[PDB]
């Protein structure tokens, strides 16, 4: 009789709970499980953050979960309450689909990995594009929130230690008339513009930029995924280039990959000595899981090369490395794939890019 | 005059009786509104116990605000309380213990306020101590515990803006979210030369950092460590690994007793509600539950905050910072002596430091 080791999940639907179950079942078939054997314990998102925190205690930690997978729900409800409660005990949380950069902050989320990259990591792709198409002078426009500044930090790290940013402009999130900011950009000789902004803020930029005739020939616009989604698409200038994280929204793919990684890490953990069990339930328990920090190190340095979403590794912040993006180009108002970033390399496909103007 | 409900929550053994009796200034409100105080006892300080307890209160009674005291060294209690405060938009005062341990970066819509000094005030107290004794050469060690940036930045901002001959030699950042089987933190600490080391972390984190620091010879004579209030924590609990000669800034009821704190907490919440009622002819309706907060959110706000931070009562300014700390706390500088007892060796009052010793005796 093997030792039962529970994995937790908070997931969007019962369909995905069943997928979690079957993934754990496959992990048990795949692995040698005479000594340790995984058990799936799962729950769907609660309708508010307090209920969610409580459920983590009542439904998951009461089963002594070694780790908790967490999907971002579609249709105000973030992983945060799960990260907080799990973090209390140093139980690792694995984000499946959350892209916000704030979850890379160790002070706030001190046992959090994710199998998708933060939006800010789109700068990695921008940078390779800037080499490829030899844009050596760019203007960077970012929203003055955490996400915008995260993108700036990331690009400037890549640049400031080739191509250079000739200026960086920040604007206040929710500003509608951005003519002041964009005239400042119009002044400069660089005509490659990179944008980090939310859907609605990108809309505002696009509109103003059009009024100032900065969306026509000679200009290049380079953005990420948010800035060609929903309403942002509606007013985006033609010839724009943006990104889509491949499988970024496929909860089933990421459940499958995350379970594989966690299963591997669990079996690796139990090769070592003096592994303690997590606390059983929240009530009465205020000490951390002593082995939590060790398990985190093991997860952090896990490699799963043959993942559904590609090559799974994690960086210093526990963020996904070797993520793959579709490179998208707005042509006659259709988003058309003109290539992919395959994790380390830009691969252009046979569809020709059309720039602003042409 | 109408009654507002205030829960006072007491974790761990407490003179409930001395507490009730200090609030006999209950004949003490000549305001538009009067408090209806209910002492609740609580035994546990995990997230579930704390959440369910306050939520049960809120649904079995109309709570305008919470006054919270505990007898633990658990800084996470502050975080849980901020979370609860923000989600339910209910004023919470953490007046003692873990609840009062610095919570940096409170939620935008938190109504959570703590007795005790800000991070930046403590940082500046530390530099005043150092300036007194001409300890101008020092290093910093922190973990990733929230505040550590505000700490380091405050030091750096102060010393870069001053003509005193500060030399900040080394700033270490210790990651204690990973295990230490590769002796990483040992190798980081080995890098320390300075005779003064400022340490920002939690009490439990310091317990480990000190153990390691000792192993590589950094806690003896020649090295003086200075820590903030939350490391010393409860001064009747002194971990064996804490080095004698440890200096702390402290706030742990030396002259400000729990009874007096509970009285002031009740007063702050009550004055604040009276002030709002007098100006807007309403106050915020106590939340009927935690379990319906998603619905009721357009109907709720942190309006009451602007009054909560600007209370004077019985002649004393009980202002909070908007960052959620007491504005003018009387701080006590303390020293861990040869008998492993924490010992008063200075006061910080009126932005002025008064130290006991001109020269530090051996301990
Ligand atoms: C994203 O796309 C990139 C680029 O296509 C991929 O990286 C390449 O992966 C391929 C494997 O398919 C590697 O190909 C191998 O190259 C070896 C020599 O590499 C040197 O020379 C190249 C070219 O100048 C340099 O880029 C590289 O840095 C090295 O200096 C060959 O020796 C290999 O041949 C061996 O295997 C083949 C089997 O196909 C046998 O036929 C041969 O006999 C021999 O045993 C092979 O050709 C290539 O090196 C990689 N390039 C780089 C730059 O790393 C990524 O794999 C891809 N990522 C994903 C997730 O798909
Ligand atoms: C500061 C806020 C914004 C985030 N904290 C919230 C904590 C929290 C909140 C609500 C609940 Cl309901 C719970 Cl349960 C826990 C997270 C928590 O405060 C992280 O605590 C830490 C972080 C780092 C370290 N240092 S380290 C990474 O070296 O080990 C220590 C404690
Ligand atoms: C999501 O990934 C799964 C593999 O886990 C795959 O079967 C499915 O086709 C994917 N869905 C989409 C829309 O690509
Ligand atoms: C706390 O414990 C005491 C005695 O052990 C008991 O009388 C009291 O009911 C407990 N309180 C709660 C809330 O369980
Ligand atoms: C509120 O703050 C103001 C400062 O603008 C000051 O008049 C006083 O301290 C407070 N008002 C009161 C307590 O009525
Ligand atoms: Cl529980
Ligand atoms: Cl192409
Ligand atoms: Cl209890
Ligand atoms: Cl919150
Ligand atoms: Cl503190
Ligand atoms: Na992380």
């Amino acid at each position: 009789d093997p030792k039962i080791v529970n994995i937790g999940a908070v997931l969007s639907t019962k369909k995905h709970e069943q997928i979690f179950r079957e993934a754990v079942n496959q992990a048990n078939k795949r692995h040698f499980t005479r000594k340790i054997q995984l058990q799936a314990t799962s729950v769907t998102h609660r309708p508010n953050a307090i209920q969610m925190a409580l459920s983590v205690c009542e439904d998951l930690i009461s089963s002594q979960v070694y780790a908790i997978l967490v999907s971002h729900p579609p249709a105000h409800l973030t992983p945060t309450p799960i990260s907080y409660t799990a973090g209390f005990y140093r139980i690792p949380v694995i984000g499946l689909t959350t892209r916000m950069s704030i979850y890379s902050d160790k002070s706030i989320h001190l046992s959090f990995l994710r199998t998708v990259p933060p939006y800010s990591h789109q700068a990695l792709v921008w940078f390779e594009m800037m080499r490829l198409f030899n844009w050596n002078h760019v203007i960077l426009i970012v929203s003055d929130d955490h996400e915008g500044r995260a993108a700036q930090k990331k690009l400037e790290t890549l640049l400031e230690g080739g191509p250079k940013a000739d200026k960086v402009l920040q604007f206040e999130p929710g500003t509608k008339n951005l003519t002041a900011l964009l005239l400042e950009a119009k002044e400069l000789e660089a005509r490659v513009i990179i944008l980090s902004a939310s859907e609605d803020d990108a809309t505002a930029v696009y509109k103003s930029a059009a009024m100032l005739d900065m969306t026509g020939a000679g200009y290049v616009w380079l953005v990420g995924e948010r800035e060609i989604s929903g309403s942002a698409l509606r007013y985006a200038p033609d010839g724009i280039i943006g990104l889509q994280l491949i499988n970024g929204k496929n909860e089933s793919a990421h459940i499958s990959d995350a379970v594989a990684v966690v299963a591997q890490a669990i079996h690796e953990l139990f090769e070592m000595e003096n592994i303690t069990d997590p606390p059983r339930g929240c009530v009465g328990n205020t000490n951390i899981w002593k082995t939590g920090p060790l398990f985190k190190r093991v997860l952090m340095s896990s490699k799963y090369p043959d993942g559904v979403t590609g090559r799974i590794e994690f960086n210093e912040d526990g963020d996904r490395k070797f993520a793959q993006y579709s490179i998208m180009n707005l042509q006659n108002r259709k988003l058309v794939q003109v290539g992919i970033f395959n994790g380390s390399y830009i691969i252009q496909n046979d569809r020709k890019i059309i720039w602003p103007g042409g | 005059p109408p009654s507002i409900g205030i829960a006072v929550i007491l974790v761990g053994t407490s003179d409930e009786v001395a507490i009730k009796d200090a609030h006999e200034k209950d004949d003490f409100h000549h305001l538009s509104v009067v408090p209806r105080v209910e002492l609740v006892a609580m035994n546990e300080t995990d997230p579930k116990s704390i959440i369910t307890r306050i939520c049960d209160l809120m649904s079995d009674r109309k709570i305008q605000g919470v006054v919270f005291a505990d007898d633990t060294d658990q800084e996470a209690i502050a975080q849980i309380l901020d979370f609860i405060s923000a989600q339910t938009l209910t004023p919470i005062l953490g007046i003692h213990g873990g609840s009062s341990m610095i919570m940096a970066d409170k939620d935008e819509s938190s109504m959570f306020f703590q007795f005790g000094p800000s991070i930046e005030q403590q940082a500046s107290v530390m530099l005043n101590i150092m300036e007194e004794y001409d300890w101008y050469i020092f290093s910093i060690v922190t973990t990733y515990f929230p505040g550590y940036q505000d700490f380091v930045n405050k030091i750096r901002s102060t010393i870069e803006n001053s003509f005193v001959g500060w030399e900040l030699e080394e700033v270490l950042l210790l990651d204690m979210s990973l295990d230490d089987g590769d002796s990483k933190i040992q190798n980081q600490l080995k890098k320390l030369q300075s005779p003064i080391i400022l340490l920002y972390c939690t009490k439990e984190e310091a317990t480990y950092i000190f153990e390691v620091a000792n192993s590589v010879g950094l806690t003896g004579y020649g090295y003086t460590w200075i820590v903030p209030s939350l490391v010393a924590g409860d001064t009747d609990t002194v971990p064996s690994e804490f080095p004698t000669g440890l200096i702390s800034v402290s706030y742990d009821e030396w002259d400000y007793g729990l009874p007096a704190r509970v009285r002031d907490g009740i007063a702050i919440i009550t004055t604040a509600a009276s002030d709002m009622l007098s100006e807007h002819s309403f106050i915020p309706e106590p939340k009927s539950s935690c379990y319906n907060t998603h619905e009721k959110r357009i109907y709720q706000s942190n309006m009451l905050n602007r009054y909560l931070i600007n209370v004077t009562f019985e002649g004393r300014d009980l202002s909070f910072s908007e960052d959620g700390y007491q504005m003018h706390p009387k701080l006590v500088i303390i020293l861990l002596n040869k008998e492993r007892k924490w010992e008063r060796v200075g006061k910080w009052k009126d932005k002025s430091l008064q130290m006991k010793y001109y020269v530090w005796p051996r301990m």
Side-chain angles (χ1 to χ4, degrees), chain B residues 117 121-130 132-133 135 224-229 232 235 245-251 254-255 329 331-336 341-346 348 353 355-357 360:
Chain B
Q121 173 138 32
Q122 293 196 77
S124 84
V125 169
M126 291 187 187
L127 288 176
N128 290 139
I129 293 167
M130 287 155 78
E132 183 74 280
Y133 301 101
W135 304 336
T224 305
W225 295 68
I226 312 187
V227 295
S229 189
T235 45
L246 189 53
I247 303 172
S248 192
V249 184
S250 176
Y251 201 79
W254 293 95
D255 321 300
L331 305 181
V332 177
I333 320 310
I334 57 171
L335 162 80
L336 182 62
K341 298 296 183 181
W342 281 111
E343 182 186 322
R344 286 153 146 292
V345 298
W348 169 267
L353 192 68
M355 295 307 282
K356 174 172 196 209
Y357 299 120
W360 297 90

Side-chain angles (χ1 to χ4, degrees), chain A residues 47-51 53-54 57-58 81 84-85 88-89 106-107 110 282-286 293-294 296-297 300, chain B residues 44-49 51-52 74 76 80 83 87-88 144 146 148 175 177-179 182 290-291 293-294:
Chain A
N48 76 32
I50 287 195
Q51 265 193 57
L54 278 171
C57 280
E58 282 182 9
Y84 282 3
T85 301
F88 184 89
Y89 295 108
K106 205 193 308 298
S107 284
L110 50 38
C282 282
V283 167
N285 294 335
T286 50
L294 175 58
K296 193 197 165 174
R297 184 192 280 302
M300 291 270 292
Chain B
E44 305 302 344
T45 44
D46 68 272
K48 175 158 169 42
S49 288
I51 283 161
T52 53
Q74 291 158 25
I80 296 161
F83 175 78
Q87 287 299 309
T88 68
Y144 281 91
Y148 83 90
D175 186 359
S177 69
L178 311 170
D179 75 294
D182 50 348
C290 310
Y291 311 132
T293 52
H294 48 290

Side-chain angles (χ1 to χ4, degrees), chain B residues 41-44 53:
Chain B
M42 225 204 310
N43 290 334
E44 305 302 344
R53 192 62 170 106

